[PDB]
Amino acid sequence: MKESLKDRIRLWKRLYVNAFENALNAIPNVKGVLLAYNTNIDAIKYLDADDLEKRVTEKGKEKVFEIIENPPEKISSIEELLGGILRSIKLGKAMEWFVESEEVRRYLREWGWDELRIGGQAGIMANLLGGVYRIPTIVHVPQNPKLQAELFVDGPIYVPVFEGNKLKLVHPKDAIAEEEELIHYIYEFPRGFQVFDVQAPRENRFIANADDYNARVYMRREFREGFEEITRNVELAIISGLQVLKEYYPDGTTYKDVLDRVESHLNILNRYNVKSHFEFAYTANRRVREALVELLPKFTSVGLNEVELASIMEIIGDEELAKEVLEGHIFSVIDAMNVLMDETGIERIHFHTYGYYLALTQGGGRQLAFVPTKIVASPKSTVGIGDTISSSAFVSEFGGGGGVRDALLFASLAAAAKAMKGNLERIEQIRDALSVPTNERAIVLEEELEKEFT
């Protein structure tokens, strides 16, 4: 090992422990955070071979196997549900089909699950920011039946309710309504799982989506009529869930009907100087993606990974640039972040990928911040890591905790801590991530940045 590397490793251990100190000291200063819009229920089933075989043969093995090779768009029958699961098994392929039959949804609910946890980017971040970081959190919950409300952890997590004409803020367990259970059913299977002659080449999972409301970005009445009163109780906002929007809907409505309401919400946030952070998850519809980019000028900040930034470069950059960004090639990423900032004028862009983060911020001049991350080799959990990274950096920077680079360092600590432990309960547990070595390949990659930019 070179002396310059050994010196850099020691420098980063220092910056990492200092950035953790700054984050613990500033997070208590955040008056409140608003999380919207997507909250649902995630039901996880660890598939059982004998159970699956018995259900396939119950419904007719022949037609179910026909469906494996002729897969439909949506689940319209129990046979299509089982055929889709076996297809995911045969291919070792992550798949998600929408359940458009109420009868299939009764079958799914009856079949059950092994564990139940909150889903949706606003839902899981309410448990992190409210439950773990102890930040007062207002979360949008489109439908809040008992099964949905109990998935929130204890802490300063709140939903708005109307006591006549006045808006109150209560824990979700105290605001249960006669509303729909929005369940995404997740069927996991290991490598080598076998059913009949079908054998998985990889571990993966098949998702049956039985959630009509988050698919339309449904906004509950408290958020459509009391948004201004809600805004007065928060300092920051994180917006997510718009990636599902379709160009057209069977009732004659379009994505514009939803984005118009989002735009009104942003206007209210900006009138109160609330800092907003948009999670720009992969948006399949290219027109909707273009409109989301046209909405970014009203956001304070936006976060994305290599796949999400490449997807955006497909509509405002060039094709070859997108491919380089997809592979995480750091100079093409930097160009892409400037292409995005030129197009929108947004104040802050946070890029995150395996090994390093980048933050491009605009002030009197554009500043670029770089951080090598802490990689857990065999993580106990990978769900919600990307949202954890993007939300943690935004909240600690705009909470005042040490600056931009330090906010990136805290997010890297939170990501590793979550990966090591599966699920966090208290923010002090993130100190354990200081034990994870910093990525040395990214540490030496910063040498290329200094030669090209100085």
Side-chain angles (χ1 to χ4, degrees), residues 195-227:
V195 88
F196 301 112
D197 43 89
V198 181
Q199 185 173 175
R202 284 159 291 276
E203 60 166 330
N204 229 317
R205 82 296 178 280
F206 180 95
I207 300 181
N209 185 332
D211 179 354
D212 294 319
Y213 285 74
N214 287 295
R216 300 183 53 101
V217 194
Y218 180 91
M219 296 173 187
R220 69 178 307 108
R221 189 180 69 99
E222 288 79 3
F223 267 70
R224 299 189 315 259
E225 305 181 343
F227 197 80

PDB file of all heavy atoms in Angstrom, residues 195-227:
ATOM      1  N   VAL A 195     -40.125 -26.803  -7.899  1.00  0.00           N
ATOM      2  CA  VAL A 195     -41.521 -27.134  -7.900  1.00  0.00           C
ATOM      3  C   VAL A 195     -41.724 -27.902  -9.196  1.00  0.00           C
ATOM      4  O   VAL A 195     -41.370 -27.430 -10.251  1.00  0.00           O
ATOM      5  CB  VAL A 195     -42.361 -25.872  -7.702  1.00  0.00           C
ATOM      6  CG1 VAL A 195     -42.684 -25.181  -8.992  1.00  0.00           C
ATOM      7  CG2 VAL A 195     -43.571 -26.163  -6.872  1.00  0.00           C
ATOM      8  N   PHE A 196     -42.252 -29.112  -9.120  1.00  0.00           N
ATOM      9  CA  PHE A 196     -42.391 -29.944 -10.314  1.00  0.00           C
ATOM     10  C   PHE A 196     -41.009 -30.034 -10.945  1.00  0.00           C
ATOM     11  O   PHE A 196     -40.053 -30.337 -10.278  1.00  0.00           O
ATOM     12  CB  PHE A 196     -43.433 -29.418 -11.277  1.00  0.00           C
ATOM     13  CG  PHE A 196     -44.796 -29.321 -10.682  1.00  0.00           C
ATOM     14  CD1 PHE A 196     -45.377 -28.102 -10.458  1.00  0.00           C
ATOM     15  CD2 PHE A 196     -45.477 -30.441 -10.321  1.00  0.00           C
ATOM     16  CE1 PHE A 196     -46.621 -28.004  -9.898  1.00  0.00           C
ATOM     17  CE2 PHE A 196     -46.720 -30.353  -9.757  1.00  0.00           C
ATOM     18  CZ  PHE A 196     -47.296 -29.127  -9.543  1.00  0.00           C
ATOM     19  N   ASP A 197     -40.912 -29.751 -12.224  1.00  0.00           N
ATOM     20  CA  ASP A 197     -39.637 -29.738 -12.925  1.00  0.00           C
ATOM     21  C   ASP A 197     -39.039 -28.342 -13.021  1.00  0.00           C
ATOM     22  O   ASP A 197     -38.057 -28.152 -13.745  1.00  0.00           O
ATOM     23  CB  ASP A 197     -39.809 -30.318 -14.336  1.00  0.00           C
ATOM     24  CG  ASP A 197     -41.077 -29.811 -15.025  1.00  0.00           C
ATOM     25  OD1 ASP A 197     -41.028 -28.749 -15.694  1.00  0.00           O
ATOM     26  OD2 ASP A 197     -42.130 -30.474 -14.879  1.00  0.00           O
ATOM     27  N   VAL A 198     -39.628 -27.360 -12.343  1.00  0.00           N
ATOM     28  CA  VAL A 198     -39.168 -25.979 -12.400  1.00  0.00           C
ATOM     29  C   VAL A 198     -38.235 -25.725 -11.225  1.00  0.00           C
ATOM     30  O   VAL A 198     -38.597 -25.972 -10.070  1.00  0.00           O
ATOM     31  CB  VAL A 198     -40.362 -25.008 -12.381  1.00  0.00           C
ATOM     32  CG1 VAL A 198     -39.892 -23.560 -12.460  1.00  0.00           C
ATOM     33  CG2 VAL A 198     -41.326 -25.320 -13.511  1.00  0.00           C
ATOM     34  N   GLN A 199     -37.038 -25.220 -11.517  1.00  0.00           N
ATOM     35  CA  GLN A 199     -36.015 -25.025 -10.498  1.00  0.00           C
ATOM     36  C   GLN A 199     -35.374 -23.661 -10.691  1.00  0.00           C
ATOM     37  O   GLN A 199     -34.993 -23.305 -11.810  1.00  0.00           O
ATOM     38  CB  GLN A 199     -34.956 -26.134 -10.563  1.00  0.00           C
ATOM     39  CG  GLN A 199     -33.900 -26.083  -9.463  1.00  0.00           C
ATOM     40  CD  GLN A 199     -32.977 -27.298  -9.485  1.00  0.00           C
ATOM     41  OE1 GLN A 199     -32.014 -27.376  -8.721  1.00  0.00           O
ATOM     42  NE2 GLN A 199     -33.273 -28.253 -10.364  1.00  0.00           N
ATOM     43  N   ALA A 200     -35.256 -22.912  -9.604  1.00  0.00           N
ATOM     44  CA  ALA A 200     -34.759 -21.548  -9.687  1.00  0.00           C
ATOM     45  C   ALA A 200     -33.254 -21.539  -9.927  1.00  0.00           C
ATOM     46  O   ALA A 200     -32.516 -22.242  -9.228  1.00  0.00           O
ATOM     47  CB  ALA A 200     -35.089 -20.785  -8.406  1.00  0.00           C
ATOM     48  N   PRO A 201     -32.759 -20.759 -10.893  1.00  0.00           N
ATOM     49  CA  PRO A 201     -31.305 -20.595 -11.027  1.00  0.00           C
ATOM     50  C   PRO A 201     -30.728 -19.572 -10.064  1.00  0.00           C
ATOM     51  O   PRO A 201     -29.515 -19.594  -9.815  1.00  0.00           O
ATOM     52  CB  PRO A 201     -31.144 -20.133 -12.479  1.00  0.00           C
ATOM     53  CG  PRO A 201     -32.402 -19.336 -12.728  1.00  0.00           C
ATOM     54  CD  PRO A 201     -33.499 -20.009 -11.926  1.00  0.00           C
ATOM     55  N   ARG A 202     -31.559 -18.684  -9.527  1.00  0.00           N
ATOM     56  CA  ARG A 202     -31.155 -17.655  -8.581  1.00  0.00           C
ATOM     57  C   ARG A 202     -32.264 -17.464  -7.562  1.00  0.00           C
ATOM     58  O   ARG A 202     -33.431 -17.767  -7.824  1.00  0.00           O
ATOM     59  CB  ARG A 202     -30.893 -16.302  -9.262  1.00  0.00           C
ATOM     60  CG  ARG A 202     -29.596 -16.197 -10.030  1.00  0.00           C
ATOM     61  CD  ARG A 202     -29.690 -15.078 -11.053  1.00  0.00           C
ATOM     62  NE  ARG A 202     -30.617 -15.428 -12.125  1.00  0.00           N
ATOM     63  CZ  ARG A 202     -30.285 -16.163 -13.182  1.00  0.00           C
ATOM     64  NH1 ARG A 202     -29.049 -16.625 -13.310  1.00  0.00           N
ATOM     65  NH2 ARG A 202     -31.189 -16.441 -14.110  1.00  0.00           N
ATOM     66  N   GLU A 203     -31.895 -16.938  -6.401  1.00  0.00           N
ATOM     67  CA  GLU A 203     -32.902 -16.386  -5.510  1.00  0.00           C
ATOM     68  C   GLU A 203     -33.533 -15.169  -6.172  1.00  0.00           C
ATOM     69  O   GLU A 203     -32.862 -14.417  -6.886  1.00  0.00           O
ATOM     70  CB  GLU A 203     -32.293 -16.002  -4.161  1.00  0.00           C
ATOM     71  CG  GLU A 203     -31.189 -14.958  -4.241  1.00  0.00           C
ATOM     72  CD  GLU A 203     -30.843 -14.367  -2.886  1.00  0.00           C
ATOM     73  OE1 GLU A 203     -31.742 -14.299  -2.020  1.00  0.00           O
ATOM     74  OE2 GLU A 203     -29.674 -13.973  -2.686  1.00  0.00           O
ATOM     75  N   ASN A 204     -34.829 -14.991  -5.953  1.00  0.00           N
ATOM     76  CA  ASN A 204     -35.553 -13.817  -6.437  1.00  0.00           C
ATOM     77  C   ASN A 204     -36.929 -13.813  -5.783  1.00  0.00           C
ATOM     78  O   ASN A 204     -37.173 -14.538  -4.811  1.00  0.00           O
ATOM     79  CB  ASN A 204     -35.641 -13.799  -7.963  1.00  0.00           C
ATOM     80  CG  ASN A 204     -35.242 -12.463  -8.539  1.00  0.00           C
ATOM     81  OD1 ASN A 204     -35.636 -11.420  -8.023  1.00  0.00           O
ATOM     82  ND2 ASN A 204     -34.437 -12.484  -9.594  1.00  0.00           N
ATOM     83  N   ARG A 205     -37.832 -12.994  -6.320  1.00  0.00           N
ATOM     84  CA  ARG A 205     -39.166 -12.875  -5.754  1.00  0.00           C
ATOM     85  C   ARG A 205     -40.147 -12.400  -6.819  1.00  0.00           C
ATOM     86  O   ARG A 205     -39.790 -11.648  -7.731  1.00  0.00           O
ATOM     87  CB  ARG A 205     -39.178 -11.930  -4.541  1.00  0.00           C
ATOM     88  CG  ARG A 205     -39.258 -10.445  -4.861  1.00  0.00           C
ATOM     89  CD  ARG A 205     -38.042  -9.920  -5.615  1.00  0.00           C
ATOM     90  NE  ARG A 205     -38.181  -8.500  -5.944  1.00  0.00           N
ATOM     91  CZ  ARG A 205     -38.896  -8.030  -6.964  1.00  0.00           C
ATOM     92  NH1 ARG A 205     -39.551  -8.864  -7.764  1.00  0.00           N
ATOM     93  NH2 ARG A 205     -38.962  -6.723  -7.186  1.00  0.00           N
ATOM     94  N   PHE A 206     -41.387 -12.864  -6.693  1.00  0.00           N
ATOM     95  CA  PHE A 206     -42.497 -12.444  -7.538  1.00  0.00           C
ATOM     96  C   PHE A 206     -43.456 -11.618  -6.695  1.00  0.00           C
ATOM     97  O   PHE A 206     -43.824 -12.030  -5.587  1.00  0.00           O
ATOM     98  CB  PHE A 206     -43.223 -13.654  -8.136  1.00  0.00           C
ATOM     99  CG  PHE A 206     -44.389 -13.295  -9.018  1.00  0.00           C
ATOM    100  CD1 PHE A 206     -44.231 -13.199 -10.390  1.00  0.00           C
ATOM    101  CD2 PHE A 206     -45.646 -13.066  -8.477  1.00  0.00           C
ATOM    102  CE1 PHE A 206     -45.303 -12.873 -11.207  1.00  0.00           C
ATOM    103  CE2 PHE A 206     -46.723 -12.739  -9.289  1.00  0.00           C
ATOM    104  CZ  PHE A 206     -46.550 -12.647 -10.657  1.00  0.00           C
ATOM    105  N   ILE A 207     -43.858 -10.461  -7.211  1.00  0.00           N
ATOM    106  CA  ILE A 207     -44.728  -9.539  -6.486  1.00  0.00           C
ATOM    107  C   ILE A 207     -46.084  -9.491  -7.180  1.00  0.00           C
ATOM    108  O   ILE A 207     -46.168  -9.193  -8.378  1.00  0.00           O
ATOM    109  CB  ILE A 207     -44.109  -8.137  -6.385  1.00  0.00           C
ATOM    110  CG1 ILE A 207     -42.774  -8.211  -5.641  1.00  0.00           C
ATOM    111  CG2 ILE A 207     -45.071  -7.179  -5.685  1.00  0.00           C
ATOM    112  CD1 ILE A 207     -42.079  -6.882  -5.467  1.00  0.00           C
ATOM    113  N   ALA A 208     -47.143  -9.797  -6.431  1.00  0.00           N
ATOM    114  CA  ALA A 208     -48.515  -9.578  -6.881  1.00  0.00           C
ATOM    115  C   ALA A 208     -49.010  -8.282  -6.237  1.00  0.00           C
ATOM    116  O   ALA A 208     -49.177  -8.209  -5.014  1.00  0.00           O
ATOM    117  CB  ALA A 208     -49.416 -10.762  -6.529  1.00  0.00           C
ATOM    118  N   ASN A 209     -49.215  -7.256  -7.060  1.00  0.00           N
ATOM    119  CA  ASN A 209     -49.579  -5.924  -6.582  1.00  0.00           C
ATOM    120  C   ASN A 209     -51.100  -5.815  -6.559  1.00  0.00           C
ATOM    121  O   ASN A 209     -51.745  -5.828  -7.613  1.00  0.00           O
ATOM    122  CB  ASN A 209     -48.961  -4.845  -7.473  1.00  0.00           C
ATOM    123  CG  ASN A 209     -49.215  -3.425  -6.956  1.00  0.00           C
ATOM    124  OD1 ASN A 209     -50.206  -3.163  -6.280  1.00  0.00           O
ATOM    125  ND2 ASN A 209     -48.310  -2.507  -7.282  1.00  0.00           N
ATOM    126  N   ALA A 210     -51.672  -5.694  -5.361  1.00  0.00           N
ATOM    127  CA  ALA A 210     -53.116  -5.557  -5.188  1.00  0.00           C
ATOM    128  C   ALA A 210     -53.489  -4.169  -4.663  1.00  0.00           C
ATOM    129  O   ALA A 210     -54.377  -4.031  -3.818  1.00  0.00           O
ATOM    130  CB  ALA A 210     -53.654  -6.644  -4.260  1.00  0.00           C
ATOM    131  N   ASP A 211     -52.824  -3.129  -5.177  1.00  0.00           N
ATOM    132  CA  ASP A 211     -52.886  -1.763  -4.644  1.00  0.00           C
ATOM    133  C   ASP A 211     -53.362  -0.824  -5.751  1.00  0.00           C
ATOM    134  O   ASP A 211     -52.557  -0.346  -6.556  1.00  0.00           O
ATOM    135  CB  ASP A 211     -51.517  -1.351  -4.107  1.00  0.00           C
ATOM    136  CG  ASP A 211     -51.479   0.078  -3.542  1.00  0.00           C
ATOM    137  OD1 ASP A 211     -52.467   0.842  -3.650  1.00  0.00           O
ATOM    138  OD2 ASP A 211     -50.422   0.438  -2.986  1.00  0.00           O
ATOM    139  N   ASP A 212     -54.666  -0.538  -5.773  1.00  0.00           N
ATOM    140  CA  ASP A 212     -55.236   0.372  -6.764  1.00  0.00           C
ATOM    141  C   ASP A 212     -54.952   1.843  -6.475  1.00  0.00           C
ATOM    142  O   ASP A 212     -55.056   2.671  -7.387  1.00  0.00           O
ATOM    143  CB  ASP A 212     -56.751   0.182  -6.852  1.00  0.00           C
ATOM    144  CG  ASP A 212     -57.140  -1.184  -7.382  1.00  0.00           C
ATOM    145  OD1 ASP A 212     -56.490  -1.656  -8.338  1.00  0.00           O
ATOM    146  OD2 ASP A 212     -58.107  -1.775  -6.853  1.00  0.00           O
ATOM    147  N   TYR A 213     -54.605   2.193  -5.240  1.00  0.00           N
ATOM    148  CA  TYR A 213     -54.584   3.598  -4.848  1.00  0.00           C
ATOM    149  C   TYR A 213     -53.226   4.253  -5.078  1.00  0.00           C
ATOM    150  O   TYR A 213     -53.149   5.319  -5.702  1.00  0.00           O
ATOM    151  CB  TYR A 213     -55.026   3.723  -3.387  1.00  0.00           C
ATOM    152  CG  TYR A 213     -56.521   3.535  -3.248  1.00  0.00           C
ATOM    153  CD1 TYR A 213     -57.097   2.279  -3.366  1.00  0.00           C
ATOM    154  CD2 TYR A 213     -57.361   4.620  -3.034  1.00  0.00           C
ATOM    155  CE1 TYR A 213     -58.464   2.101  -3.259  1.00  0.00           C
ATOM    156  CE2 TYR A 213     -58.734   4.451  -2.920  1.00  0.00           C
ATOM    157  CZ  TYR A 213     -59.281   3.192  -3.035  1.00  0.00           C
ATOM    158  OH  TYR A 213     -60.648   3.019  -2.930  1.00  0.00           O
ATOM    159  N   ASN A 214     -52.147   3.632  -4.598  1.00  0.00           N
ATOM    160  CA  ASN A 214     -50.816   4.149  -4.892  1.00  0.00           C
ATOM    161  C   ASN A 214     -50.484   4.080  -6.378  1.00  0.00           C
ATOM    162  O   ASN A 214     -49.625   4.840  -6.840  1.00  0.00           O
ATOM    163  CB  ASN A 214     -49.753   3.393  -4.087  1.00  0.00           C
ATOM    164  CG  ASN A 214     -49.764   3.759  -2.614  1.00  0.00           C
ATOM    165  OD1 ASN A 214     -49.481   4.899  -2.245  1.00  0.00           O
ATOM    166  ND2 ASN A 214     -50.077   2.790  -1.762  1.00  0.00           N
ATOM    167  N   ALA A 215     -51.139   3.186  -7.133  1.00  0.00           N
ATOM    168  CA  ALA A 215     -50.931   3.138  -8.576  1.00  0.00           C
ATOM    169  C   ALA A 215     -51.401   4.420  -9.252  1.00  0.00           C
ATOM    170  O   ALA A 215     -50.890   4.788 -10.315  1.00  0.00           O
ATOM    171  CB  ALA A 215     -51.657   1.932  -9.181  1.00  0.00           C
ATOM    172  N   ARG A 216     -52.376   5.104  -8.662  1.00  0.00           N
ATOM    173  CA  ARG A 216     -52.884   6.358  -9.198  1.00  0.00           C
ATOM    174  C   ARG A 216     -52.345   7.579  -8.455  1.00  0.00           C
ATOM    175  O   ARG A 216     -52.775   8.699  -8.741  1.00  0.00           O
ATOM    176  CB  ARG A 216     -54.412   6.364  -9.152  1.00  0.00           C
ATOM    177  CG  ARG A 216     -55.067   5.248  -9.947  1.00  0.00           C
ATOM    178  CD  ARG A 216     -56.575   5.388  -9.908  1.00  0.00           C
ATOM    179  NE  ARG A 216     -56.985   6.722 -10.333  1.00  0.00           N
ATOM    180  CZ  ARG A 216     -57.451   7.008 -11.543  1.00  0.00           C
ATOM    181  NH1 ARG A 216     -57.572   6.049 -12.447  1.00  0.00           N
ATOM    182  NH2 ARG A 216     -57.797   8.250 -11.846  1.00  0.00           N
ATOM    183  N   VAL A 217     -51.406   7.387  -7.526  1.00  0.00           N
ATOM    184  CA  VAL A 217     -51.006   8.425  -6.576  1.00  0.00           C
ATOM    185  C   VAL A 217     -52.270   9.051  -6.002  1.00  0.00           C
ATOM    186  O   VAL A 217     -52.521  10.251  -6.169  1.00  0.00           O
ATOM    187  CB  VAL A 217     -50.089   9.494  -7.213  1.00  0.00           C
ATOM    188  CG1 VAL A 217     -49.412  10.344  -6.123  1.00  0.00           C
ATOM    189  CG2 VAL A 217     -49.033   8.849  -8.098  1.00  0.00           C
ATOM    190  N   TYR A 218     -53.091   8.232  -5.351  1.00  0.00           N
ATOM    191  CA  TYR A 218     -54.241   8.746  -4.622  1.00  0.00           C
ATOM    192  C   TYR A 218     -53.784   9.652  -3.481  1.00  0.00           C
ATOM    193  O   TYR A 218     -52.861   9.312  -2.737  1.00  0.00           O
ATOM    194  CB  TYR A 218     -55.061   7.578  -4.077  1.00  0.00           C
ATOM    195  CG  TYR A 218     -56.296   7.966  -3.291  1.00  0.00           C
ATOM    196  CD1 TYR A 218     -57.524   8.106  -3.924  1.00  0.00           C
ATOM    197  CD2 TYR A 218     -56.243   8.158  -1.914  1.00  0.00           C
ATOM    198  CE1 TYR A 218     -58.660   8.442  -3.213  1.00  0.00           C
ATOM    199  CE2 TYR A 218     -57.381   8.494  -1.191  1.00  0.00           C
ATOM    200  CZ  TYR A 218     -58.584   8.633  -1.850  1.00  0.00           C
ATOM    201  OH  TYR A 218     -59.719   8.970  -1.149  1.00  0.00           O
ATOM    202  N   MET A 219     -54.430  10.805  -3.343  1.00  0.00           N
ATOM    203  CA  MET A 219     -54.149  11.743  -2.261  1.00  0.00           C
ATOM    204  C   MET A 219     -55.377  11.819  -1.365  1.00  0.00           C
ATOM    205  O   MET A 219     -56.475  12.111  -1.846  1.00  0.00           O
ATOM    206  CB  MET A 219     -53.792  13.126  -2.814  1.00  0.00           C
ATOM    207  CG  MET A 219     -52.513  13.143  -3.645  1.00  0.00           C
ATOM    208  SD  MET A 219     -52.208  14.729  -4.445  1.00  0.00           S
ATOM    209  CE  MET A 219     -50.793  14.341  -5.468  1.00  0.00           C
ATOM    210  N   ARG A 220     -55.199  11.553  -0.072  1.00  0.00           N
ATOM    211  CA  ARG A 220     -56.355  11.576   0.814  1.00  0.00           C
ATOM    212  C   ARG A 220     -56.814  13.013   1.076  1.00  0.00           C
ATOM    213  O   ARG A 220     -56.087  13.985   0.842  1.00  0.00           O
ATOM    214  CB  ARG A 220     -56.050  10.860   2.129  1.00  0.00           C
ATOM    215  CG  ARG A 220     -55.052  11.550   3.045  1.00  0.00           C
ATOM    216  CD  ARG A 220     -54.881  10.747   4.341  1.00  0.00           C
ATOM    217  NE  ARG A 220     -56.173  10.478   4.972  1.00  0.00           N
ATOM    218  CZ  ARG A 220     -56.757   9.284   5.009  1.00  0.00           C
ATOM    219  NH1 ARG A 220     -56.153   8.234   4.465  1.00  0.00           N
ATOM    220  NH2 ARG A 220     -57.942   9.136   5.591  1.00  0.00           N
ATOM    221  N   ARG A 221     -58.047  13.128   1.583  1.00  0.00           N
ATOM    222  CA  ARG A 221     -58.714  14.424   1.666  1.00  0.00           C
ATOM    223  C   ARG A 221     -57.970  15.397   2.571  1.00  0.00           C
ATOM    224  O   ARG A 221     -57.979  16.608   2.319  1.00  0.00           O
ATOM    225  CB  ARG A 221     -60.152  14.240   2.156  1.00  0.00           C
ATOM    226  CG  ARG A 221     -61.002  15.511   2.070  1.00  0.00           C
ATOM    227  CD  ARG A 221     -62.420  15.276   2.569  1.00  0.00           C
ATOM    228  NE  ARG A 221     -62.473  15.052   4.011  1.00  0.00           N
ATOM    229  CZ  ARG A 221     -62.781  15.986   4.908  1.00  0.00           C
ATOM    230  NH1 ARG A 221     -63.073  17.222   4.517  1.00  0.00           N
ATOM    231  NH2 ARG A 221     -62.806  15.683   6.200  1.00  0.00           N
ATOM    232  N   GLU A 222     -57.318  14.895   3.623  1.00  0.00           N
ATOM    233  CA  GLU A 222     -56.583  15.783   4.519  1.00  0.00           C
ATOM    234  C   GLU A 222     -55.436  16.479   3.800  1.00  0.00           C
ATOM    235  O   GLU A 222     -55.149  17.648   4.082  1.00  0.00           O
ATOM    236  CB  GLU A 222     -56.066  15.004   5.731  1.00  0.00           C
ATOM    237  CG  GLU A 222     -57.153  14.599   6.732  1.00  0.00           C
ATOM    238  CD  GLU A 222     -57.944  13.372   6.297  1.00  0.00           C
ATOM    239  OE1 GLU A 222     -57.625  12.789   5.239  1.00  0.00           O
ATOM    240  OE2 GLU A 222     -58.890  12.991   7.016  1.00  0.00           O
ATOM    241  N   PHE A 223     -54.791  15.795   2.853  1.00  0.00           N
ATOM    242  CA  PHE A 223     -53.701  16.392   2.090  1.00  0.00           C
ATOM    243  C   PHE A 223     -54.186  17.291   0.959  1.00  0.00           C
ATOM    244  O   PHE A 223     -53.445  18.186   0.539  1.00  0.00           O
ATOM    245  CB  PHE A 223     -52.795  15.302   1.512  1.00  0.00           C
ATOM    246  CG  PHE A 223     -51.620  14.962   2.383  1.00  0.00           C
ATOM    247  CD1 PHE A 223     -51.798  14.291   3.580  1.00  0.00           C
ATOM    248  CD2 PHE A 223     -50.333  15.299   1.993  1.00  0.00           C
ATOM    249  CE1 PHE A 223     -50.720  13.970   4.376  1.00  0.00           C
ATOM    250  CE2 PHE A 223     -49.242  14.976   2.787  1.00  0.00           C
ATOM    251  CZ  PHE A 223     -49.436  14.314   3.979  1.00  0.00           C
ATOM    252  N   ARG A 224     -55.403  17.077   0.453  1.00  0.00           N
ATOM    253  CA  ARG A 224     -55.916  17.915  -0.622  1.00  0.00           C
ATOM    254  C   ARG A 224     -56.590  19.181  -0.122  1.00  0.00           C
ATOM    255  O   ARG A 224     -56.741  20.130  -0.897  1.00  0.00           O
ATOM    256  CB  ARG A 224     -56.906  17.131  -1.492  1.00  0.00           C
ATOM    257  CG  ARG A 224     -56.300  15.914  -2.170  1.00  0.00           C
ATOM    258  CD  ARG A 224     -57.267  15.317  -3.181  1.00  0.00           C
ATOM    259  NE  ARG A 224     -58.628  15.227  -2.652  1.00  0.00           N
ATOM    260  CZ  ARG A 224     -59.191  14.114  -2.187  1.00  0.00           C
ATOM    261  NH1 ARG A 224     -58.522  12.965  -2.189  1.00  0.00           N
ATOM    262  NH2 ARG A 224     -60.439  14.151  -1.732  1.00  0.00           N
ATOM    263  N   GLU A 225     -57.006  19.220   1.145  1.00  0.00           N
ATOM    264  CA  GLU A 225     -57.688  20.380   1.699  1.00  0.00           C
ATOM    265  C   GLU A 225     -56.959  21.020   2.871  1.00  0.00           C
ATOM    266  O   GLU A 225     -57.275  22.163   3.221  1.00  0.00           O
ATOM    267  CB  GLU A 225     -59.109  20.004   2.149  1.00  0.00           C
ATOM    268  CG  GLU A 225     -59.945  19.357   1.051  1.00  0.00           C
ATOM    269  CD  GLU A 225     -61.350  19.006   1.503  1.00  0.00           C
ATOM    270  OE1 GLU A 225     -61.591  18.959   2.727  1.00  0.00           O
ATOM    271  OE2 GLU A 225     -62.214  18.776   0.633  1.00  0.00           O
ATOM    272  N   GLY A 226     -56.004  20.329   3.483  1.00  0.00           N
ATOM    273  CA  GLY A 226     -55.293  20.885   4.613  1.00  0.00           C
ATOM    274  C   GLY A 226     -53.795  20.892   4.420  1.00  0.00           C
ATOM    275  O   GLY A 226     -53.044  20.830   5.396  1.00  0.00           O
ATOM    276  N   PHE A 227     -53.342  20.979   3.168  1.00  0.00           N
ATOM    277  CA  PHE A 227     -51.908  20.925   2.913  1.00  0.00           C
ATOM    278  C   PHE A 227     -51.190  22.125   3.508  1.00  0.00           C
ATOM    279  O   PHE A 227     -50.074  21.990   4.025  1.00  0.00           O
ATOM    280  CB  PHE A 227     -51.620  20.845   1.417  1.00  0.00           C
ATOM    281  CG  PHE A 227     -50.219  20.396   1.113  1.00  0.00           C
ATOM    282  CD1 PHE A 227     -49.889  19.052   1.168  1.00  0.00           C
ATOM    283  CD2 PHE A 227     -49.229  21.317   0.804  1.00  0.00           C
ATOM    284  CE1 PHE A 227     -48.598  18.629   0.901  1.00  0.00           C
ATOM    285  CE2 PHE A 227     -47.937  20.907   0.540  1.00  0.00           C
ATOM    286  CZ  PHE A 227     -47.619  19.558   0.589  1.00  0.00           C
TER     287      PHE A 227
END
